[PDB]
Each structure stands twice: as C-alpha cells, then as structure tokens.
Structure 1
Amino acid sequence: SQTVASHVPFADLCSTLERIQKSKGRAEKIRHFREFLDSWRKFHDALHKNDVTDSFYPAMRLILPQLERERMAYGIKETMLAKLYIELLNLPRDGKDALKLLNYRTPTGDAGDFAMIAYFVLKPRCQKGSLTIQQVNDLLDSIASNNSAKRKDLIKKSLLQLITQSSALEQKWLIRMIIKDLKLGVSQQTIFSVFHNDAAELHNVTTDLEKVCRQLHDPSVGLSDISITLFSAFKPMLAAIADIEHIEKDMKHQSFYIETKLDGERMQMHKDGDVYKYFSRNGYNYTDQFGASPTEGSLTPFIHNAFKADIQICILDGEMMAYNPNTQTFMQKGTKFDIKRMDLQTCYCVFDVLMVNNKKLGHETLRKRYEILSSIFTPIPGRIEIVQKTQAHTKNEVIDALNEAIDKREEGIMVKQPLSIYKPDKRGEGWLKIKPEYVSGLMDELDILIVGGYWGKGSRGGMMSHFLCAVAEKPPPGEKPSVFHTLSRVGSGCTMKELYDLGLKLAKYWKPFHRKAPPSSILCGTEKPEVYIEPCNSVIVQIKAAEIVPSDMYKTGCTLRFPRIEKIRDDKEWHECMTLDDLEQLRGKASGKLASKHLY
C-alpha cells in the first residue's frame, strides 16, 4: 500500500546530490549515487515483503528532471521563480536581495547561477526541512497542475508550502529541479548504467522514466528483446555530419540512398485502427493537433484512407511539413506558421516505418523498411507522402545532389546505408547529413559589428557571453558610418579564452543601455541589449548563418538563422562593417539563403 518515497526525507536526497556535485571524479560521483540507490532498494525489499507499483521513480524523476514527462511544465524559469520568491518571502522590492534575484546574471563568485544566488538570499532568512520525497513530488505536481489550470494564486500557495518546510540547502536543489538543471557533473547515461545495464536502452524505446524504474527494479533481472512498442514514444534515429571526401567509405563502398533533407519538424505516428498518436522529437504528445481519430485533427482525417486495407497497426517516422495548395510547394519551417498548431495544409512526409501489424521492423535493413513502406499506403500529395530514396554509388553523385539542393534553395541532403538497421537515439550509424554550411567556402558570411552585450549564465556566468550585432548606413566617400541598424544576436563560435579576451578588451567601453534614452548611433528594433558600446570602440565579427529570414525584432527587418561567430576580425576596423546595401544584396541574391555557390 505504502511507498518507499513516503519514508525517505527529501534532505537525504539533497545530501546525496550535494556529495555527487562536490565530488571531483566520476568514480566518486558514481559511488555516492550507488550508496543512495542501494540503500533505497534494501529499504524497498523490507517495506513490501510480498504486486506493488512502487519503484525508484519518485527519486529518479528529481535526479533526471529533464526526462520528466508525466508532469506538465511548471511555467516557471529563473525570472518567474525570482518574482515568486520576492513576493512569497516579502522582500523589499527595490532591496539588494530582490534585485540580485531578478538580475542574477549581473555580477555584484556566483553570477549566472540562480540557485546558488537564491541560496545565499535564503540562508539567513530560513528551519531544516521535513518533507519526504513523495511530499515534494506532490507539491511539484500541484505547481504543474495549477499552472495548467491557470491559477497563479494556487501556484503561490503550493510553492509557499515548499519554501516554509524546506531548508535553504534543500530549496537550492528544489530550484534546480524546477529549472530542470542539476549540474551534477555526471551524465544521464552514467546514472542509467548504475541503475541497470538495460536502463539506457529501455529509455530510448520508451521515453518513460517510470516504466524504466518499474520494469528494471531488479539490477540482476534483464529484459531480453527491448524494442519499439506501439503507442510508446521512442527516441528517433539521428544523422551524423558526413565527410564528403569519404562518403563512399562511410557507406561501406556499397550502393547507398540519397534523399532530400526536409525543413519541417520530426514526428512519429502510431496507428491502431481508428486510434492514432503522434510524438515529437523529444517525446511530447501532439495528438490534439494532428488527430486521435479519422474525424479530428489537422492530418489524421486526410490520411486515414491512404493506408492499405490490411494495415491495422503501423508505426511511422517522418517529417511534418506545411504544404501550400496553391503553389503545390512546401513552406519551409519557420516564419508565419507552426505545423503543430495551425489556407495551408499539414503534410506528413514519411521516410521510415518501425512496425506493421504483428511485425517489428527496427532490425530490418533500411532497404527492406523502404520496400515495406512503399506498399503499406498510397501517397496523397500534400497530405502524406513517401520521401524518395534515390540510389547512388559515387562521391560525384552526392556532390551533384548537394548542388541540386543548393540550386533548389533546399536545406541539404541525407545519405543513408541501405543495409543499416533503425538505431534509436543514435547519431550516424548509417544515417549521414550534408548541408552547404558544412563545406568550407560555400557560405556567404557577414562582417558585422558588435553593438550590444548581455551577461552570461551557467558556465559562462560573470562575462559578456553573447552580443547584439548591427550593420552600418553607407557614408559619403572618405567618411565613416555613424548610424547602425541591429541585425541579430549571436553567442556561439568563440572559445572561452576568445570570449574572455574579447571581454577584457571591451570591458572599459560598455555603457548601460537606457530604453528611454537610447544612443543615437545604434537603432534597435524590439530587441534591446543590456549594455551598448559606441561603434568606434567595438569589434567586427565574421558571422556564418544559414539564411536571412524575416524578423519583427531587429531594425533591419530581418535576422540570421543559426548564427555563429566564425572569426573575431581583429584585422578589420569598426568602420569596415558591412552596410545595409550589402545586406540587401545578400538577402535577394538567393531568396535569403546564404548558400548559393556550388561545391567543386
């Protein structure tokens, strides 16, 4: 009747988490987790003696909070947690503690760590806790439920019970469990391996923490044929970046497939007669949009009769696309629509199948699965299609297909082994992807100017880790530009030393940004920085992006998709920044794509 979690204090879990975090090496980290796990299982045998659904799940879901799927979203991140703590603790709204919580990335040695910053605010203001692990999970259920119920007052009540009955140390971990980032220094594969030799593999075919804890409760009992099951979300197979020069060797010198890389959203479909379920890339259920029955949804009523008559059970893997009925073309993922919440029509482009009736297909060759896929339903253009797998054998065909995708303004191509099996959650292992941005020289890059700064968080706390960037207005001959229009934010591509060195150089030039008193040299759209810098003191950065897309957030009216810093252009001066004219040329050069040049 009872549960182990109802007898384990939450402080015992926090003690283990504190020992794992402070532990230096992986051996020490594993040891502390095993002591907690072994003790839990010993207690588990005693309490129950002889059915039982109880398991390590109430503790596992807090150790791996990113894997939580039963509980809905809390609706709370660092900003809301700070506001709630200010209101529940009744902090002076303009005091030092309230401003530190709301501005936890601005340093005042823990800038960028909201939990640690909250801990020091709480240490003198808080009573050692008394809640059990089950009680904590019950209160976390209440917060998620009340967020879904749109009862902010009940969130405050549920959280106030957590604050009152927990020590400052416990609340630091409760905050990390709510944010879903524990910073234990040990990966979820290591946690899984300690729990059971089959936990990782079983999680990849279920995405269900409680099923993993329930089925693999005995570390000696191992499951035999762990596989994809109907109506269970499996982690989809992924694709590694191909080395174009070695593509024939990577395909084992045999024939291979080449298919277009579609710019949609990954989605898997489970079918049993009139019952359908749809799961996203990370396992979230989107049946409400696509349709649980042939009478509801954006997709299911239009595909129900595409299937052959003898198809009772079916598991599909594909890419959800927006189809334009007028132009008979796909609208790429991004602006103006969301395929999971839609005069366009949802089109499901299928490229794999994992089950047909009483037949599991994950261990069949890709060619065999492609053969079965081509016979289990009749395609309906613009509703449900099959991704064509063009056969090829040479490196020169792959380069042609890439240039064809560049010409067609497509994202890229996929290259797959026809003899490979379906390996859930595996990157590569038969699937390769090729984009223009992977080839040196193909991309038209942008030399733009840093104009704004933002404080970092986490491992990049305490420094300006990302930046607001702008382009210049063309000045008369011999003159330098004086007005800049913001284009995009960027915060990746630099090593930590380069970010640190750039931070020391620009340190003495940052000026606090005032939205009611902006600088005249920088014209911002909706997006405002935390600090600005006058252009003459700043630095040019060379930006690689995939394309220029519309934006309501930057003064140029457009921004960059997938931007990153390729080089910090110390060899350029600030006034050598690219102008709005250079941007307009690039934007209309190839419908926004920054790839318009063939590989040779």
Structure 2
Amino acid sequence: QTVASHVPFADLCSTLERIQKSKGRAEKIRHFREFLDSWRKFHDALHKNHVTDSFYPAMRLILPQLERERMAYGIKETMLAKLYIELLNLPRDGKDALKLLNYRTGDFAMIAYFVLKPRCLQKGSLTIQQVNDLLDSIASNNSAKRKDLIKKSLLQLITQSSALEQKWLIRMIIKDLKLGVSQQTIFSVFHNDAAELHNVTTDLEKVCRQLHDPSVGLSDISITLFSAFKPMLAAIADIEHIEKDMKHQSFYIETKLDGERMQMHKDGDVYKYFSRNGYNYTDQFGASPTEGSLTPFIHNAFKADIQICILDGEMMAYNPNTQTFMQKGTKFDIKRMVEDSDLQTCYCVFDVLMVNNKKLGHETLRKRYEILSSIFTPIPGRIEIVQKTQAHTKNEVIDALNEAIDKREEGIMVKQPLSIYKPDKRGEGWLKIKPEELDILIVGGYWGKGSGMMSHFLCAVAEKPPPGEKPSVFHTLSRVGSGCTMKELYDLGLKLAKYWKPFHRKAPPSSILCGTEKPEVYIEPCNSVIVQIKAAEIVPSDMYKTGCTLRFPRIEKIRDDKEWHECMTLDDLEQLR
C-alpha cells in the first residue's frame, strides 16, 4: 500500500498549474507546501499500522530534470504532434496540425493544451503511481528501440488524462516544468536537509525516503561510497586580482583539462563511475577489472594498501602514437576511434575524497593532494595525477596560462591549499582562469618540446601585392602551438612534411621576413596553408617582424577552403588594432 497509488495525478497537476500562474515567489511556494502537507498527513493516515513509501513518485515528476532511475524517453515533439493529429482527428493541413509539427521555441505543451482544451473533455483517471508506471514503460521501450510500445504507452497516458494533465505530462516528459521557482527553493521547502543530502547522493528517492519527517535531520551528511556526489566547481577569476583572491599566501596552479568530469568509486574488484550529473557510466569504463574500457588497465595501478577509494578527475581521449590528449571539438569521431583502439580513455585525477575507512572531504586540499600521491602509481595514458605546481606570483599565474595555451589546454586552475571539498558549490577554494579572428599563413615550424611531429608553427601576414598580383613577401607575426590535440593538425603536419626546408639565419628566404624569432624550418608560401587563429589581443613585440604579436594565440581550424594568397595583410592587421 502506497500513497501515490491513491493520489490522483490530477491533484498534482492542479498544484503545478496553481504554482505556475502565481506571480510571487511566496504564493508559488505556498501551493507546493499545501500539496506536500496533504501528502504527509495521508501517508501517516495510511501507514499508521505499517515503510519504504515516500514522496518520490511526486518529487520525480516535480523535479523531472533530477530523474535518474528512469532513462531517456526518446520522445520527439513531432511524434507527439503526429500522434495528437491522428488522435484528435485534426485536418492534417490545418493551422493546429502545422503549429504542432513545425514547433520551434508559448512552449510545446502550451500549444498542445490550447488545441486539446476545447476538444478534450475527459476528467483524468490515472494515479500518480500509474503515470509513473506508464513513464517507466516508455523509457524501457526506448532502450529496447520499440517505437510501437512507446506509441501505445503514450496512448494510455493521453486518452486517460485531462487536457491539463496532458499539458503537464508533456513538460514532465520534456523535463522542463517552467514553474518559476528554483529546485533549490523546492528542496528547502521539502526539508531543511534536502539540498545538502542531494549534493552527496544525486538521488531524489533517498532524499525523500531518508528525510520523510520534516523535523528529523541527518546529523552527518557526507560523501559515501557508491553514492554520486555533485562535483565541486570553480569560479571565474580575473588575472590582475589573483594574488588577493588566494589570500596573499601560497597556492596551487593546476592544469585545466577539457574532458568528461567523472568520479570513480572503488571497493576491491568493484567499480562505479559517475558523471557531473550523477549518471552511471560504469558500463563504459568497467565495473570489474575483467570488464570495461578503463578499469582493466588501471585496476593493477592501485597500491597494495588500497581497498577503497573515491577519486575526482577528467576522462580524456589519449592518442598513444602522438602522446596527446584529444580536444572535444574535432571533425573526427572521438567516441568511435576510442572504441576502435586508435584512441584510449585516460583518467586524469585531481582529487581523492576517501581512502579505505577514512573520509577526506574536510581535509585541506594540501592533505588530499599528499594522500593522492599514495593511492596509485600513475600509468601515462590511462590514469594520471594532473600536473600542478606551487606558486605565489601574478606573473607566475601569467606564465602558467601562456604555457597552457601554447600546449593547447583551455586554461589553468588556481586552487587554495587550505580549502576543503564542498560538493556542488562553485568557487570557495577553486578558481579557473581562461583567456580574457585572424586568417593567417604558416611560414615555418619547430620541433622539440613535443613529438617527428612539430611543437609549433611560425605564422605570418602578407604584404599587400600590386593589383593583379599574388603576395610575394610575408612578415612574421606569431609563434603558435601545433600539438595534435585535433586530428586535423595531425593531418596537416603529414601533408606539409614534404615542404619544410632548413632555415638559415645567415641566408634567409626573400618570401618570409622574420623579427628576432627564427623558425628551424620554413615553407614556400604557395606550398602552405592558412590557419584560422583565435587570440586575446594584439600586443607589442621585438620577436616578430610586425612589431607586434598575438597574446594567447590558439589555432581554431585549418582553412583549407582558403588559398595561400588569401592571407590577411599588414593592412588587415592595421585595422584590427
């Protein structure tokens, strides 16, 4: 016997409707308080004699974006449209039908409601349980790729509900209630302790079950093994005011990695992995050392004394042949090459929350790092400790950021050493710093510092030729990193290899004029390629012929659609200043 099997889904939607149309935050909260309170009174009425029953059946429909039990619905609003058209017998070429089908972004539920309103007169039949039953069935049949059984499940949902129930059903499926009150507000009204508990278990059900009585608190809410906690986040930081931000004492600068944030929970032969939103990615990485794309290659990297631990880090795609991490944005397909063994998952770890019996959240950052060094012996390309150093200078933070960008990382992290780990709070001890479009030509290259492959390109601008003429002279403007973080850079290097020529300071080429800075090798401009380069500003320089250069230059794309003679010019450079 359960409450949701007794409460009409209609009661829920009335409350949702009463909430949405309310202007003030106070009136909004009030309708929900009212709903929560009747649920509670009835539960006690129901369970006097009796429990695992809880508010969850409703809570999961009220904060549907926090659903974690039920997988994706795989329902497209077009299906809904076509379905309603067939169902309601609407003229397939009329305004209603077309409004639904060609919906962009007064949302889809509103449009459906206004079509349903004069046409659907039924009162609802479903209980909150039944709706939940029906949604289960939709998610399940989506996983099975059974469209007929989704259609049929939607059918039971729709024809058994009222128009308003249908409006909210849709929002519950799209996972956007548009209520006008934050989820944090909702949790606060539900329980003093809800929000905090959810931050250490991304799980509505435990939230509701464990905090069913509003007057019983939990004494020690903490990160538990195999419970998904929300990751600690980093605050945006101004470079000019960083020393103060770090309280004028010594701090950590750590590499900022652009990958999939992931937590690993390990107890002996047993593994779980959770993403930033508390989704279970174990099947991918491996539950056991005999299964997965990662666990088997790292299981034996854990030191002898280590039975249980919890790590925080970034999953990267690593290329063994070039010893590089692959960035998110590429014309190529990371998800499939990783599967095809041209690439491999590498876990890049920057924090530990527990080891064996002890819980580390309230340890200072310094101690967790110290501990981290004793959990496993790193394996390059599978599981690494993130590169970091100790610093105290604004200049240092600048030097680190240049170095990061040159190596094609997105930025750097700055972290205060005494800081504890605060799940889902952004800032505190953790800061992130990122930099804060030219089409120019590659005219030279460098090896060393990377590998074979090139570490950097020397790039230049065109001196505007006579009319009818292609350019013949180039002025160097900037070095830039060419680490193969994307396959197109890899491909470029191989296309370009036949063209490199030794650069001689004592007898340079007439086509490329250099400043103090000299390439090891150059390339005749006609044989080369335009790169599109992102840069923060143009700053003075003696190293390059232009008398200026690019701060934080990154290559965005290779412009194979342009021609070498289409290079931006000194004059093009003038205007950018």
Deviations 1:406-434 (A, max 9, x none): 22222110000111011101110110001
Flag the 1:258–1:508 CA change in 2: closer, same or farther, 3 A: closer
1:270 has 2:265 as partner: yes
Cα distance in 2 between the residues matched to 1:581 and 1:545: 18
Cα distance in 2 between the residues matched to 1:526 and 1:132: 77
What's the offset of the Cα at 1:310?
1.3
1:448 has 2:443 as partner: no
Cα distance in 2 between the residues matched to 1:497 and 1:334: 10
What are the residue-to-residue correspondences of 1:477-496 with 2, within 5 Å? none
Deviations 1:269-313 (A, max 9, x none): 010111111111111111111111111111110101110111111
Greater Cα shift, 358-367 or 508-517: 508-517
Residue 10 of structure 1 is matched in structure 2 by: 9
What's the offset of the Cα at 1:81?
2.5
What's the offset of the Cα at 1:156?
0.8
Flag the 1:448–1:67 CA change in 2: closer, same or farther, 3 A: farther
Cα distance in 2 between the residues matched to 1:274 and 1:219: 39
What's the offset of the Cα at 1:333?
2.1
Cα distance in 1 between the residues matched to 2:401 and 2:326: 20
What's the offset of the Cα at 1:561?
19
1:559 match: secondary structure: strand
Cα distance in 1 between the residues matched to 2:125 and 2:521: 44
8 Å contact from structure 1 (residues 207, 283) kept in 2: yes
Cα distance in 1 between the residues matched to 2:509 and 2:80: 32
Match of 2:114 among 97, 120, 142: 120
What's the offset of the Cα at 1:568?
26
Cα distance in 2 between the residues matched to 1:315 and 1:86: 51
What's the offset of the Cα at 1:262?
0.9
8 Å contact from structure 1 (residues 294, 300) kept in 2: yes
Residue 591 of structure 1 is matched in structure 2 by: none
Percent identity between the aligned chains?
Answer: 100
2:113 match: secondary structure: helix
Cα distance in 1 between the residues matched to 2:518 and 2:158: 34
8 Å contact from structure 2 (residues 408, 483) kept in 1: no
Cα distance in 2 between the residues matched to 1:120 and 1:267: 43
1:142 has 2:141 as partner: no
What's the offset of the Cα at 1:148?
1.1
CA RMSD of aligned residues (A): 14.0
8 Å contact from structure 2 (residues 307, 356) kept in 1: yes
Deviations 1:188-207 (A, max 9, x none): 00000000011000001100
Match of 2:523 among 533, 538, 545: 533
Flag the 1:38–1:333 CA change in 2: closer, same or farther, 3 A: same
Long gaps (5+) in structure 2: none
Cα distance in 2 between the residues matched to 1:528 and 1:88: 73
Flag the 1:134–1:544 CA change in 2: closer, same or farther, 3 A: farther
1:5 match: secondary structure: coil
Flag the 1:7–1:473 CA change in 2: closer, same or farther, 3 A: farther
Flag the 1:365–1:517 CA change in 2: closer, same or farther, 3 A: closer
8 Å contact from structure 2 (residues 456, 483) kept in 1: no
Flag the 1:470–1:138 CA change in 2: closer, same or farther, 3 A: farther
Cα distance in 1 between the residues matched to 2:277 and 2:166: 28
Cα distance in 2 between the residues matched to 1:11 and 1:309: 57
Flag the 1:579–1:428 CA change in 2: closer, same or farther, 3 A: same
Long gaps (5+) in structure 1: 106-110, 438-444, 588-600
8 Å contact from structure 2 (residues 33, 189) kept in 1: yes
TM-score (norm 1): 0.73
**Bigger-Rg structure (1/2):** 2
8 Å contact from structure 1 (residues 540, 568) kept in 2: yes
Greater Cα shift, 476-485 or 213-222: 476-485
8 Å contact from structure 1 (residues 279, 286) kept in 2: yes
Flag the 1:38–1:255 CA change in 2: closer, same or farther, 3 A: same
8 Å contact from structure 2 (residues 408, 554) kept in 1: no
Cα distance in 2 between the residues matched to 1:508 and 1:93: 61
8 Å contact from structure 1 (residues 113, 458) kept in 2: no
Cα distance in 2 between the residues matched to 1:523 and 1:125: 76
Cα distance in 2 between the residues matched to 1:491 and 1:305: 35
- Tell me the matched-pair count: 572
What's the offset of the Cα at 1:344?
1.3
2:234 match: secondary structure: strand
Flag the 1:537–1:378 CA change in 2: closer, same or farther, 3 A: closer
What's the offset of the Cα at 1:345?
1.4
Deviations 1:191-247 (A, max 9, x none): 000000110000011000000000000000000110111111111011010121221
Match of 1:168 among 152, 163, 167: 163
Flag the 1:7–1:577 CA change in 2: closer, same or farther, 3 A: farther
What's the offset of the Cα at 1:79?
3.1
Flag the 1:298–1:153 CA change in 2: closer, same or farther, 3 A: same
Flag the 1:516–1:408 CA change in 2: closer, same or farther, 3 A: closer
8 Å contact from structure 1 (residues 454, 531) kept in 2: yes
